[PDB]
Subunit: 321 residues, 4 copies
C-alpha cells in the first residue's frame, strides 16, 4: 500500500491510497451519514457528527474503514505495519483509550485540523482489541491529512507511540517512518535533470534517451523502494490546476508505484497486487477509485442526500482475487 | 515511449503505447475511412481499402499517425530511435520505396497478417524524406502486431534494415532491439516469488514486506530500464478474461512504466512525460486513451458509421 | 571506513578495518608496551597492564589510536559517525567518566572479554573533550571484538548510549547501527546461487555469465551500501584454515568494499579513498597492513621483545 | 574475469587480469625463453624470437597461456566469451590460419606494437581446433595492449571477427564488447562528486556520508556490472608515479571488482571466485600476482638468465578449489 496527498494552488486537498493485498476482504464503498450510532469500547457511546466516505466493511452495523474522509476535508488511511505495530494490552487509567480499529472514526468524527489531532493524541492510548472475537487486530499505522499537513501515527513494540510530520505526503509499509526518512539521504544522487555526453578517457559516453539523472531509482515493490519513488515523484510533480488535472496527477503517481499483478507472489503462493486506487477530493467531497480489473474511474459523493441518510449507504463489493 | 501488446484467452489482441514527449504536437484521434485519397511519394497514388484509427495530426489532408490500427486487427506504432535511425538518401529502382512517414498507412492499408508484412519488407526501402520541407524526418523505429505475433522494424546507420520477432510484446527507445533483448539476460535474478527469513551468521534477516524477489528492478525512465520492467511485467501478468479486465491490465502495465511529469527534465530544460496512454482492442475495434491531465478513459470506435465516412473524422486535441 | 571480524575453525580471531579519509593524518603503527604512563582526564592516572598495537598518532607522549588490539586478543576500532555522535558536556559524578578519545586504551587495557566490556559500559559516560584545544573531538562510534562476539558502541544525540551485538561482524559509518541492521531485510532477495535459463513467453532469457543471483548488490561507497555488501560477503565467505588463508580472506573482503581513489570527491573537492587496510591476527599477535600506494603486506608483532619495551615503538608514516 | 591496463606518467604499462573460475586448472607461472621450439598447426614451425612470461599450463612441451607478456612490453590475456565465441570450422585458403589457442604466442612472438597487430589481423582466420584431442576449444575473446593502445579481439557466431579500440582499458566476459560500450550510456548519471543537502518540499534530505554521487553503481559479479564498475574506476583513477604506486593502483582496482569466494555459486553447485590477480609491469619485466588464499604479492621476472634458458621455467602449481 502507498498513501499519497498533495494540494492544488488554492489549497484543495487530494488524498488517498493504493490497496495492495494478497486476498479479497469483501470491501466496498461506505457512506456513513450524520447522526449514525457510534459505540466505543472504552468511552461513552455517541453518534456521528460528520458524514464520512471511504472503503471498508460493515461489522454488525459498524463501518470498519480501510480509509475514510469527512465532509470537512480531513481524512485518514490505515496501512499495514507488520513486524512493528504493537498496541497496549489493555486500557490505561486516565488516558483516552481507543481500540486500534476505532481511530478511523474517532479522528474523522472529532477533528477538522491535523494540528488539533496532534495535540489530542498526546493523551491517547491505542489498545490491542478487535471489534469482536471473530476478528484479529490489524497491525496498522496511519497517515492523517488536512489541506495543511499530513502526519504519521505509529505505535510499535520497538519505539512506542510516535507522531511524525510528513512533508513528503507519502506513506508505505514497514519499517518505521523515521527509517524511511533516513533512507532518503542515501538517494541524494537522484536528479530529474538528464545527464549529457561525457568523455571516458576519450571514449564518448552519452545518454541514449532521457531519464539518465534518476539512475538508481528503484522500481520494485519492496515498501522502502515504493517509499523512495513515491516521495521523489510527489515532491517533483508540479502543482496543477483544476479538479480533473489534480485527480489525474494523483492516479499518475499512484499507478506508477502500483504493485502489478503477477510481479509479486507471497510466500504462500498468492499474487499480491494493487486491487484498487482511491482519491478523495476535499473540494468536491468526491471519492474516486478504480480497480485492477476495471480501469475507468468510479465516483461516490457526500452530498445533501447521502450526508443525511438514516442508515449506511453501502455499495456492493466489486470482486477480486 | 513504451509500446505493449498481449492477447486474452481467445486470441483477442490488446495493443497500444505511451507517448512520452517534451513538447505539444497538436495530436488527436483520427479515423481514416475506407476509400480515402492516399498519395505516395514514390508509388502510384491510390485510396484506402481499410478503415484505420489512431493518434496523429493531419497535414494537407494526409493523416500523419503516431500509432494506428486497421479494422482487421493489425496495428503499428512509431517510437523514437535517436542516434540510430537512418533511412536512404533517395529511392532505389526495383524496391518498394516509401518515405519513412508513409509506412504507417502502407502497413495498415495492405496487410492483415504480420507474416505477410515481414515477407513484403524484404523488398522495401525507407527514404529520408518528410511530407514537405516544413517538417523534419522523425528518427523512428516501429512495433507491428496482429493477434499472433509482434515484430520490430529498425533501420539504422549501424546495422541497416532489421526485422525482429518480439515475443516480449514490448518496445521502447534507443539502443537497438537486439541490445535490449541481450540486456534481459542480466536480469535473470529477478523472481516474482518473495524471499523468506534468513540466518546471516545467526542474525535473523527477513523481509519487512512483500516484493523482495524483484530486488534490482529499475524504476527510472531510461529506455533500457523501461524495457526491462515492461517486459518483466508483461510476461508475468496472468492472462485475463473479457474486455474490461484486459483493457485494465493494459493500462495497469503502461501506467507502471509511465514517465511521470517533473521526474525527467531534458537537456533543454523541458519536462518529458507520458502525455497519453492508448489501447486498441481488436475484438471491439475500440481505441481507448487517457491523458496526463484527464485520467478518465475516452473511447473511439471503428463501426459501420465511421468506417464508411465521407471525410476524416478528427476528434479534438 | 569498514570494520570487519571473523574467526577460523579453531576460534582464532581476525579483526581490522579500512581507513577511508580525504586527508593525511600522519599515522603509523604504534606498539604501546606494558607499564607505560597512562593518564586519564577524569580518573586516577595509571600505567598500562597489557601491550597493545595499532594505527594512530602520538600526542604529547599519548598514543592516539585509530584502531588497537591487546595481547590477549581483544580489539577496538573507531570509525566516523557524523551527524549522530554526541557525548556529554562534562563529567557526571558516579559514572566512569572518559573523554571519548580515551575509550581506545580504556577498553584494551582493562578487558579480555567483550561480555565484561558491555557490563562495564552501563556505568560509563563519554565526555565531549579532546586531549587539548589543538584537536577537535572526533564524532566516532566503535566496534569491539574478541574471538566470541563483536559489539557496536554508539552514543548519539538522537538515541543516547547504545550497545549492540554484531553477528554480521561489520561496521561502517552513518546512520546508526539499528538502521543498517533493518536495511538488510530489504536485500533478502540476494542469493549467491546463479539464476538459470528462463522462458519469457517463449523468448529464451538466460545468464551471460555467473553472478546473476546477486542482482541489486550495491557497488558504490555510500556507508549503507558498503555495510550491506560487507555483511553479505562476510556471512557467505566459507570458514578457512590457517593463518595465510585467513589473512587473505580478510583482505579479499575489505579490498572488495574499498573506497577507490578518484571515485569519490567530497563537497570540499578532495578525493576520499581507502588509505590503508589492516588486519590483526590474535593467534599470532600480528598486525598486517597495506596502503593505497604500497600493496605488499607489512607485518608488526607483539612478542616478548616489543611487549616489554621501555618506550613506544613507533614505525614510520 | 576482468582485464585491466593503464600507464604511468612516463608511458610505462601496467596490464593484467583477475582469473575468476569455478574449478582448478592446475596452472602456474611459465617463462618461455628465446629460441624455444614453436610449432603451428597451419603455418611453418619455427622458434620463439622473444621471451614471454605468464600464467598457464604446459601441454606436451607447449606453453598454453591464460595471459602472457613479451620482453618488449606487449601482452595479451584470454578471457571467456561463452554463448558468443565461435571460430572457423577449418582453415581458409589464403588466410593466416591460427587455431584459437595459438593466438597467445603468435601475437607475443611477432609484434611489439598493437597498431601492427591490428593490421595483421585483417588477414587472420581463427580456427576451431584444440592443441590435441584430449582438450576442448576454449570459447575465448582477447584483450591485447602495448603502452599506447589496447584492442579487443572477438570472433562470434553473431558478428564474425571484430577488432575494437578499447579506450576504457578493461574487458570482462559476455556479451560482446560493443554491447558493453553501449551499456555505458545508461550510466551517465554516475558522478564521483558527492551530492549535498536538498529540500524535498521542506524536508531536509542530506547525505549521511560520502559516495552519494555514484548511486546505481553495481557491485555484483555479473560481467556487464563488473565492466561498468571497472571502466568507471579505471578512467577516474588518477595517474600515479613509480612502480610501487602503479602496481598498488592496479591491485586496488582489480581487487575492487574481484569475485569473492562464497558470494557466487554456479548452477553445478561450485564456488566461482577470483583465484589469482596478476599484473605485468613492462618497465621492470616483472609479473606480480597474489591468490585467494595467499595475499602477499609474488614476483617473477624476465631477465638475462630466464630469457636465455634452454627449456621452459615452470613454477609449481599453487593449489585452489
Ligand atoms: Na462505550
Ligand atoms: Na546520479
Ligand atoms: Na505518387
Ligand atoms: Na587523572
Ligand atoms: Na534476486
Ligand atoms: Na606447422
Amino acid at each position: 500500500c502507498t498513501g499519497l496527498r498533495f494540494t492544488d494552488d488554492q489549497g484543495n486537498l487530494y488524498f488517498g491510497r493504493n490497496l495492495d493485498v494478497g486476498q479479497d476482504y469483501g470491501e466496498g464503498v461506505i457512506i456513513t451519514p450524520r447522526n449514525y450510532p457510534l459505540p466505543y469500547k472504552f468511552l461513552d457511546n455517541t453518534t456521528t457528527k460528520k458524514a464520512v466516505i471511504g472503503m471498508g466493511i460493515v461489522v454488525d452495523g459498524y463501518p470498519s474503514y480501510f480509509d475514510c474522509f469527512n465532509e470537512d476535508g480531513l481524512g485518514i488511511a490505515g496501512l499495514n505495519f507488520p513486524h512493528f505495530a504493537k498496541f497496549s494490552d489493555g486500557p490505561i487509567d486516565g488516558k483516552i483509550n481507543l481500540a486500534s480499529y476505532e481511530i478511523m472514526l474517532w479522528v474523522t468524527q472529532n477533528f477538522t485540523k491535523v494540528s488539533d489531532v496532534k495535540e489530542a493524541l498526546k493523551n491517547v492510548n491505542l489498545v490491542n482489541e478487535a471489534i469482536n472475537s471473530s476478528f484479529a487486530v490489524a497491525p496498522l499505522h496511519w497517515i492523517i491529512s488536512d489541506k495543511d499537513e499530513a502526519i504519521i501515527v505509529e505505535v510499535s513494540k520497538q519505539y512506542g507511540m510516535k507522531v511524525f510530520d510528513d512533508k513528503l505526503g507519502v506513506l508505505t509499509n514497514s519499517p518505521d517512518f523515521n527509517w524511511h526518512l533516513t533512507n532518503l539521504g542515501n538517494y541524494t544522487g537522484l536528479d530529474p535533470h538528464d545527464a549529457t555526453a561525457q568523455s571516458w578517457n576519450g571514449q564518448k559516453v552519452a545518454p541514449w534517451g532521457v531519464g539518465t539523472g534518476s539512475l538508481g531509482l528503484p522500481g520494485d515493490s519492496i515498501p522502502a523502494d515504493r517509499f523512495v519513488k513515491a516521495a521523489y515523484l510527489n515532491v517533483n510533480y508540479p502543482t496543477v490546476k483544476g479538479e480533473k488535472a489534480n485527480v489525474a496527477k494523483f492516479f499518475n503517481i499512484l499507478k506508477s508505484v502500483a504493485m502489478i499483478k503477477g510481479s509479486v507472489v507471497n510466500k504462500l503462493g498468492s499474487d499480491e497486487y494493487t486491487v484498487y486506487t482511491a482519491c478523495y477530493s476535499a473540494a468536491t467531497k468526491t471519492y474516486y477509485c478504480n480497480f485492477e480489473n476495471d480501469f475507468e474511474l468510479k465516483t461516490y459523493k457526500l452530498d445533501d442526500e447521502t450526508m443525511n441518510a438514516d442508515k449506511l449507504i453501502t455499495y456492493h463489493h466489486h470482486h477480486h482475487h
